[PDB]
Ligand binder design. Structure first.
Ligand SMILES: Nc1ncnc2c1ncn2[C@@H]1O[C@H](COP(=O)(O)OP(=O)(O)O)[C@@H](O)[C@H]1O
Ligand SMILES: Nc1ncnc2c1ncn2[C@@H]1O[C@H](COP(=O)(O)OP(=O)(O)O)[C@@H](O)[C@H]1O
Ligand SMILES: [Mg+2]
Ligand SMILES: [Mg+2]
Ligand SMILES: [Mg+2]
Lengths: 600, 600
């Protein structure tokens, strides 16, 4: 009894392509363990693929893998990891030539090295559990006639063997080990703060990435990571029962110095993605940071609206103000200042900076220049004069790659040096250098944690009313009607599915606007915890808050409640192409909308 | 006898849109002083507009305006300026509501503030001179039927009144003054080097730009430019007979310091566009620099192929080399080093740098850091240790906006300080600061003027053979088949017509490839002069040369000989949408092609 779908396609062979519409909302049993529901049908063969939901039984033990017999009680971190393993096993089927033929007609979201919650694969209650996988399938045509034999080949000779062999026939022991490792990664990260660290870098980690675009670990001539002994510490990982050792970094300022190309940025990049759990053989596994960490850099030409950058830029010429700063075209230093103050507003407790991509004028200032141009005639206060304030008064740590100056040596708690990819702790040497040279707080903090900033939907969106489609373009941008929001320098976005999540939230605001703003604001404001990209709901620290950030957190939480598919009118996406992202990245995107208007 | 075109459109009213093809290559006299030739006809009403050539008599005195009675003998600088004035007068007609109705169907290239040679408007021999203007016109349809009345309205009630009133009826005295001023700008710039300067900034200049996208001068609260007396000098402008006074900058290193937002970058931006003549009321008029000046900045993530960056980055770990450097993903410092060495190869004798957009690690290094990480373990040599070499041994000057360090004070010839938009010469103060502090050449130059670098068309293009359309996207990029060449940080591109010129040259190489490489190389190598963007053919200085740059100069020269319309197979453009660009920007684009391959 698996032939009805084939019998259908045989019946419409050669007929007008429009007649495919009759598949809409029908479900077919196409093999013993595979059902397929058509969620939508392409209007013609050149349109984007028809969306389907494919369903298989869950054949592994829930008790062994998820530690419960009841699916609804399962730890979301383990459920997410299991969905991520199934997704990888599906794609591995293609790589290993499991389909009898590969049509090129099937599109399923391809995961990065990171283990994110995604709408692609769901472990759900059976219609005991089943597995749903969402895909788009280009139903072939000859001109405007249906290629029924071509369609039959896709379903019966491609999707069926893949799902039967790679999903129904998945290796349960590999699945279990994947899920243990991910759960231990998440428990390790969540133990950092309590143990007195902002970051941990496992011994044996392979940090550099291979050549090109795979983001896979460098396969040859890689120097495994080895902690300086002065910083080495050990964590027990309860799910695998293992003990891991590596470099712990304490709160305060850590500097990473060393020659260009000696491994500094590679270490820092592993830290930036340390907010995500990784596939087990990734190399950066158990390299973790505070989940609110934000990569800060210069970003000249971006727009800014209503951000208080007065801690870094103040006293402009001609009474111009920076307490509610607005620009359509930021410089290096003003973009970086705005990036910092926006990250603080969205709650980041750890700033990660790389001198190679910061604005010099915000990083450094030497004594010679101050004699020529006195501080009172220089609007810009460098980060070195604010970094201790952030840390001591607001508990915000900083990790900074540096190479050009020793001006941070006195402020630093730890100074690392990378040389030929080997790391040393050189804190004592640096302090001696600073003390033997000619370098230079119950003082009111310049940082105001109660930020006064509210989204103005009317002013933000009105320009654009003059369908209203919001869509994600790769990982690089969002088209918002005729506007383009450039995300290419929001560096902790790792999957195009996350840009789709962002687009949905921005459209939600557009489609909901008057009442949705206060509602999301109230909802986000009442939250004590937010979902991480790994599906786990963590406690929110830090005193920084604002209506704008609470509103963003409410959107993000609401998208999580809707399983990453908001289905709002102005953002139409095929189902199963969205990946979880922090409310931080959703706010980063709205901050960059060129028509943005905010108000006090 | 002007009704035949109307009679045609009346005859095809309501007929199939395909029948418009019969207009191809026909010419119509649509008023006493206006002819219109259809160069191509849209295949349907949704296609890009049909291209037309519109021709009017030249009614001003050639002798008065161009100083000759024979068009072919006219100075190209004056001919270009006259074409640019006609183009502006045409667009001004729209602004002033001259057409009886504005259909929105007519597209003619819109000039920037700069006076470039363009294929849009030509002063040509009469079929005594006439004026050609190239346009695209969307011939309206109702569904797939011809709207003949709509077309008649465009030609007879829009283009005819515009051309009759604004081109045939142009103000000859305004035209003359435009042409005098432009010619004086060009003569001023070409006199710089001989007089001992690399830049001149006229007194009375208004440098800041108004809010937003117009690039017009700031209309309110602008502080006119006033030279420090120590640098003030005077030039006589022979065409107007006037004498202009302003700040002359001598060869060597000039620093521009002062607080953020006190006017430094605004001065530097006026210098970067000082390679172009400007419309007379622009504000930056008579602000000129060496015509080979290049804006240098950091540009992380660009690709580089076969560039010797060894003067800045050398002695990497593990015998990696930088004498023929290759990367798919440059850092801040490596992109900036490559930008510098590529500009030198293409012949630039003046580097313009803004600290706010440079890579810190290439700009600066202090003594404290050198004690922690000795110079021998640091691949990166900062620009401050190479800037005197460039200047003394190769005659390459530098003008740099700085704010973070006094480390360049000893090397500088001139130190300017901007405060509240007022400028001072503070060279003496800076030198005293450096001498009273603790700061630190028949030495072999590290810079090799005989660059060894050849374009490899086979390796560069082969990937992309797997129509081959090359096109310009605004001023931001070129689509080269499925490749995208990002030009958004090639900052002296000022018109989308220039990106079209670039695209034509790149397609020329693609379409011509084996034999075209040696031919262009030989042609560019033999040139003693190249055409400027203003249409004037200047003498090429400096010893830097390579096969790659000669090849680029040959392409640029050949495009100039073809009046900015190459008509190569892989780059199809409507006629009249191209603007002159230096061979420097054409090479900048090819340098950034991600499949680029070069060879020694
Ligand atoms: N542990 C390692 N083993 C092998 N190669 C490495 C390692 N760490 C970094 N690299 C490689 O060295 C090169 C330069 O590294 P990077 O950290 O960019 O240096 P920096 O940021 O100090 O300029 C990169 O191509 C990187 O992949
Ligand atoms: N001569 C002037 N008159 C009026 N405004 C000016 C002048 N020069 C610059 N400005 C304005 O001051 C602001 C900051 O100028 P900018 O040169 O960017 O400073 P910096 O590069 O020193 O940070 C800009 O908006 C600019 O338009
Ligand atoms: Mg680096
Ligand atoms: Mg960009
Ligand atoms: Mg600036």
């Amino acid at each position: 009894g698996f032939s009805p779908l084939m019998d259908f396609f045989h019946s419409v062979e050669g007929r007008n392509y429009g007649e495919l519409r009759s598949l809409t909302n029908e479900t077919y049993q196409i093999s013993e363990n595979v059902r397929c529901t058509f969620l939508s049908i392409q209007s013609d063969p050149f349109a984007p693929g028809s969306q389907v939901r494919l369903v298989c039984p869950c054949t592994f033990s829930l008790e062994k893998v998820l530690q419960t017999t009841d699916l609804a009680a399962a730890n979301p971190c383990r459920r997410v990891a299991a969905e991520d393993f199934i997704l990888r096993s599906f794609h591995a089927g293609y790589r290993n030539g499991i389909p009898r033929r590969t049509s090129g007609a099937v599109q399923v979201l391809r995961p990065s090295q990171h283990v994110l919650e995604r709408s692609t694969v769901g472990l759900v209650k059976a219609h005991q559990a089943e597995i749903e996988i969402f895909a788009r399938v280009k139903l072939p045509g000859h001109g405007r006639r249906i290629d029924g034999h071509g369609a039959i080949d896709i379903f019966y000779n491609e999707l069926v063997p893949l799902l039967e062999q790679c999903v129904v026939g998945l290796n349960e022991e590999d699945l279990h080990q994947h899920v243990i490792c991910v759960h231990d990664q998440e428990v390790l990260r969540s133990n950092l703060l309590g143990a007195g660290y902002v970051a941990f870098v496992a011994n044996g980690a392979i940090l550099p990435r291979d050549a090109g675009n795979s983001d896979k670990p460098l396969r040859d001539n890689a120097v495994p990571f080895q902690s300086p002994k002065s910083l080495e510490c050990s964590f027990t990982l309860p799910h695998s029962g293992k003990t891991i050792t590596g470099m712990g970094l304490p709160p305060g300022l850590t500097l990473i110095a060393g020659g260009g190309f000696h491994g500094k940025s590679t270490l820092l990049r592993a830290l930036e993605v340390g907010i995500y759990n990784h596939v087990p053989d990734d190399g950066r596994t158990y390299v973790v940071v505070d989940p609110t960490a934000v990569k800060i850099r210069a970003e000249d030409r971006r727009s800014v609206h209503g951000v208080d950058i007065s801690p870094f830029i103040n006293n402009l010429p001609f009474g111009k103000t920076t307490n509610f700063f607005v620009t359509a075209d930021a410089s290096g230093s003003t973009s970086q200042a705005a990036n910092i103050m926006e990250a603080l507003e969205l709650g980041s407790q750890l700033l990660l900076l790389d001198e190679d991509t910061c604005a010099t004028n915000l990083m450094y200032r030497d004594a010679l220049m101050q004699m020529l141009v006195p501080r009172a005639q220089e609007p810009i206060t460098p980060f070195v004069e604010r970094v201790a304030d952030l840390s001591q008064n607001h508990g915000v740590s900083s990790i900074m790659v540096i190479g050009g100056s020793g001006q941070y040596f006195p402020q630093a708690r730890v100074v690392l040096v990378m040389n030929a990819y080997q790391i040393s702790d050189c804190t004592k040497e640096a302090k001696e250098i600073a003390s033997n040279s000619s370098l230079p707080g119950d003082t009111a903090s310049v940082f105001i944690p109660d930020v006064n900033r509210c989204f103005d939907p009317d002013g933000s969106f009105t320009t654009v009313r003059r369908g209203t489609k919001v869509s994600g373009i790769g990982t690089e941008s969002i088209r918002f009607s005729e506007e383009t929001i450039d995300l290419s320098m929001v560096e902790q976005i790792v999957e195009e599915g996350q840009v789709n999540a962002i687009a949905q939230c921005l459209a939600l605001l557009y489609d909901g606007e008057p009442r949705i703003v206060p509602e999301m604001t109230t909802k986000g404001g009442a939250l004590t915890q937010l979902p991480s990209p790994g599906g786990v709901c963590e406690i929110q620290r830090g005193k920084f808050n604002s209506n704008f950030s609470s509103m963003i957190a409410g959107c993000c939480s609401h998208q999580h409640d809707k399983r990453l598919e908001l289905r709002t009118p102005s953002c139409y996406l095929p189902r199963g192409f969205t990946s979880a992202t922090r409310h931080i990245e959703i706010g980063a995107a709205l901050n960059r909308l060129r028509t943005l208007r905010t108000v006090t």
